[PDB]
Scaffold this active site. Sequence first.
Site, PDB file in Angstrom:
ATOM      1  N   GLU B  67      13.889  59.697  -2.677  1.00  0.00           N
ATOM      2  CA  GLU B  67      14.397  59.927  -1.309  1.00  0.00           C
ATOM      3  C   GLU B  67      13.540  60.893  -0.494  1.00  0.00           C
ATOM      4  OE1 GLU B  67      17.148  57.740  -0.655  1.00  0.00           O
ATOM      5  OE2 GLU B  67      18.826  58.551  -1.631  1.00  0.00           O
ATOM      6  N   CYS B 122      18.130  39.824   2.711  1.00  0.00           N
ATOM      7  CA  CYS B 122      18.934  40.011   3.902  1.00  0.00           C
ATOM      8  C   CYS B 122      20.422  39.907   3.531  1.00  0.00           C
ATOM      9  CB  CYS B 122      18.687  38.965   4.948  1.00  0.00           C
ATOM     10  SG  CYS B 122      19.590  39.369   6.453  1.00  0.00           S
ATOM     11  N   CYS B 158      18.084  38.796  11.922  1.00  0.00           N
ATOM     12  CA  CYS B 158      19.432  39.334  11.752  1.00  0.00           C
ATOM     13  C   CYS B 158      19.517  40.744  12.352  1.00  0.00           C
ATOM     14  CB  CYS B 158      19.867  39.356  10.305  1.00  0.00           C
ATOM     15  SG  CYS B 158      20.066  37.709   9.642  1.00  0.00           S
TER      16      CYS B 158
HETATM   17  C1  LIG Z   1      18.233  53.993   7.148  1.00  0.00           C
HETATM   18  C2  LIG Z   1      18.760  55.376   6.853  1.00  0.00           C
HETATM   19  C3  LIG Z   1      19.229  55.752   5.577  1.00  0.00           C
HETATM   20  N1  LIG Z   1      19.736  56.963   5.401  1.00  0.00           N
HETATM   21  C4  LIG Z   1      20.195  57.354   4.127  1.00  0.00           C
HETATM   22  C5  LIG Z   1      21.207  56.387   3.535  1.00  0.00           C
HETATM   23  C6  LIG Z   1      20.965  56.687   2.088  1.00  0.00           C
HETATM   24  O1  LIG Z   1      21.718  57.854   1.683  1.00  0.00           O
HETATM   25  C7  LIG Z   1      19.511  57.058   1.965  1.00  0.00           C
HETATM   26  C8  LIG Z   1      18.708  55.841   1.467  1.00  0.00           C
HETATM   27  O2  LIG Z   1      18.429  55.801   0.063  1.00  0.00           O
HETATM   28  P1  LIG Z   1      16.911  55.108  -0.429  1.00  0.00           P
HETATM   29  O3  LIG Z   1      15.675  55.929  -0.112  1.00  0.00           O
HETATM   30  O4  LIG Z   1      16.693  53.727   0.159  1.00  0.00           O
HETATM   31  O5  LIG Z   1      17.203  55.104  -1.912  1.00  0.00           O
HETATM   32  O6  LIG Z   1      19.113  57.552   3.284  1.00  0.00           O
HETATM   33  C9  LIG Z   1      19.789  57.900   6.453  1.00  0.00           C
HETATM   34  O7  LIG Z   1      20.158  59.060   6.227  1.00  0.00           O
HETATM   35  N2  LIG Z   1      19.301  57.586   7.653  1.00  0.00           N
HETATM   36  C10 LIG Z   1      18.794  56.389   7.924  1.00  0.00           C
HETATM   37  O8  LIG Z   1      18.435  56.105   9.067  1.00  0.00           O
HETATM   38 ZN   LIG Z   2      18.870  37.650   7.766  1.00  0.00          ZN
END
Ligand SMILES: CC1CN([C@H]2C[C@H](O)[C@@H](COP(=O)(O)O)O2)C(=O)NC1=O
Ligand SMILES: [Zn+2]
Lengths: 165, 165, 168, 168
Positions: B67, B122, B158
């Site tokens: 993360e 998707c 989408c």
């Molecule tokens: C798209 C996101 C996602 N997130 C968060 C949702 C999840 O807790 C995490 C994504 O986990 P990942 O790196 O894909 O294992 O980040 C945000 O805080 N802001 C955003 O704009």
């Molecule tokens: Zn789609």
Amino acid sequence: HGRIELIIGPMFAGKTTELMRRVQRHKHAQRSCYIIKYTGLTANVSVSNLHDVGDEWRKYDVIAVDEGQFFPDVAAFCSKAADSGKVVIVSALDADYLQEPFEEICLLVSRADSVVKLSAVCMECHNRKASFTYRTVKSDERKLVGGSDMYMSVCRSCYETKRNM
Amino acid sequence: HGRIELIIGPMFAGKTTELMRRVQRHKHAQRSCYIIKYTGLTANVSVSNLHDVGDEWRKYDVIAVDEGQFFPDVAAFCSKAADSGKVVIVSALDADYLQEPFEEICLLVSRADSVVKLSAVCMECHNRKASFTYRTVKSDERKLVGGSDMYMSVCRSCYETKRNM
Amino acid sequence: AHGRIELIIGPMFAGKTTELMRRVQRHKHAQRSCYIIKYTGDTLTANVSVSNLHDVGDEWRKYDVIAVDEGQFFPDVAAFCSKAADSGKVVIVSALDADYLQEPFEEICLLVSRADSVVKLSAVCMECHNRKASFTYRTVKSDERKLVGGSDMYMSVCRSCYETKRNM
Amino acid sequence: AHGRIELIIGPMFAGKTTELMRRVQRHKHAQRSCYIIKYTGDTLTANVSVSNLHDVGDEWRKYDVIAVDEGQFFPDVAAFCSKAADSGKVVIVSALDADYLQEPFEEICLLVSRADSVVKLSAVCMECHNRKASFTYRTVKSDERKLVGGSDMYMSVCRSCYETKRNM
Ligand SMILES: CC1CN([C@H]2C[C@H](O)[C@@H](COP(=O)(O)O)O2)C(=O)NC1=O
Ligand SMILES: [Zn+2]
Ligand SMILES: CC1CN([C@H]2C[C@H](O)[C@@H](COP(=O)(O)O)O2)C(=O)NC1=O
Ligand SMILES: CC1CN([C@H]2C[C@H](O)[C@@H](COP(=O)(O)O)O2)C(=O)NC1=O
Ligand SMILES: CC1CN([C@H]2C[C@H](O)[C@@H](COP(=O)(O)O)O2)C(=O)NC1=O
Ligand SMILES: [Mg+2]
Ligand SMILES: [Mg+2]
Ligand SMILES: [Zn+2]
Ligand SMILES: [Zn+2]
Ligand SMILES: [Zn+2]
């Protein structure tokens, strides 16, 4: 409609982890997945022949086959499933401990939409990427189920070096 | 000596699974691995700043950061570690829910030896590969920790379609 | 229909333009119409040389596949690519992700977040000849960020060679 | 020192030869000596055209990097590649993995097991123009396994187009 994806490479390369990574992706989109393992939204089965699965595989969107090199009829099975519209994902060793191909996995290479060969890290020198599986115990049985006790993944020169001593 | 490897892509693409696949490979060759996670042969830590790790990371061959987009100083940290000879592996979102880049991860792209962008499937149409993360609940906070309750990975069209309704 | 953005990055000498043309050729075997955009200051399918993407006009709408070479020189590249992919084009871009100081081209960073696919190629270190290279080192003295040239002015290097050389 | 075998496979029109030359060029920027071997019946670095690898002799020992194009035509390719990689060469091979009946070239199958790296490229389906293509379909009537030619005799197709066409 269907495809075949193949994941190859030596032992300890993470082929099974990659197979599951892919299965998981499909599960998040609500696809049904059927996982077949070898033995001497979701579903699992341990089997020693793909014949013994019967037609159960038709109920699923995605079919995953682990340790494909232990199944004698794997190419025909995968082709049948992909012709029926399934996404078929196979993890397998491409090469045995003598660096000789599993003939059935070769056939899958020619039929696959996708082929990835993962590498491991050399367990002998700890310094290079490893593409071969060296058997550290003295059988001449091609099939010999085991772990790091009986096998190491090695780079090309470590494979040679060990083959001497 | 050191490098930086970066794994990007939208949510539900299996970035963390790929990071661990790689860590595991290194562990089989007896490399010491230090895994850093975020919070609001082996070792683990949950932290909210990479500062709070101190110099503990120097005891390891391989440093993994999960993360990466939640850590404000991640690029400088990774560069420091790779300059000291570590293998640094980072999983991170490249884009936020508005398809705008995390600036720190962009900087990591320019400093990385390797960059892979994984895709998801998707979750809206279930038919295409997905490269974007759509937030399904109505905050305007950039950071908002959550799962499939609050986010979907979607294909390009989408993403647009939903952005209307 | 199914537009997308594919991005090819990496340092100089990594073969990014060759990879771009590999991809174009594939599409051409399937009779897709392909348009190739190059940068004007830069030193056969439909081809044009421009110094910004706005000067292509609407000519790009006549093609299935749009290829943009040296994307880091175009100031409006992210928006152009998004507009084209929203209209259903396959958009393929080759670009440096980093300048000679290892600082990002911001517009390319934007593209990373908008791309369906991103590949970062490497070169072979032209200093030590032993390692993969991810950085471009400028070998002439100019502080201009933009400075067009080849192996007469740049070389691609691994992470430690870049450091070593930077001390001199 | 660190020899290896890199293998590039996939059907016709997938850009395998272009990828091979992309890789060669990378090595050439780092001043590595590169030798390119082509097949004789087939229709500038050091280059030779031969109908088997034995006819190259020991000339390959003068190079860092050996590139073999159309590997499926050479009967002794696996052994040659292994001998060269054991001597410390980087060996890069482009080859069809499958013939027009989707049966493997056995020698290439051997190479898969000996390779450090294997990439399978795809083409774009030249029948439907909508899907990635992994197979080569022969469009002329010959039952000879080997039959040299281009898009005058072959096309690359997706899995369902291959089936569809096979009924006719
Ligand atoms: C798209 C996101 C996602 N997130 C968060 C949702 C999840 O807790 C995490 C994504 O986990 P990942 O790196 O894909 O294992 O980040 C945000 O805080 N802001 C955003 O704009
Ligand atoms: Zn789609
Ligand atoms: C190299 C091998 C490996 N094996 C076995 C050891 C393991 O049980 C299994 C490998 O698991 P994998 O596909 O890498 O998850 O196959 C053989 O039977 N014969 C060989 O020659
Ligand atoms: C690293 C560079 C390269 N360049 C130029 C030199 C070349 O003309 C062009 C090549 O990039 P390419 O790998 O072909 O897309 O980019 C700069 O102007 N500034 C820099 O900082
Ligand atoms: C599919 C083919 C192709 N070929 C030939 C046609 C071309 O001359 C050559 C092209 O293969 P390439 O993709 O360039 O490595 O291989 C056969 O001889 N038999 C077959 O079954
Ligand atoms: Mg270029
Ligand atoms: Mg070719
Ligand atoms: Zn080794
Ligand atoms: Zn170097
Ligand atoms: Zn088709």
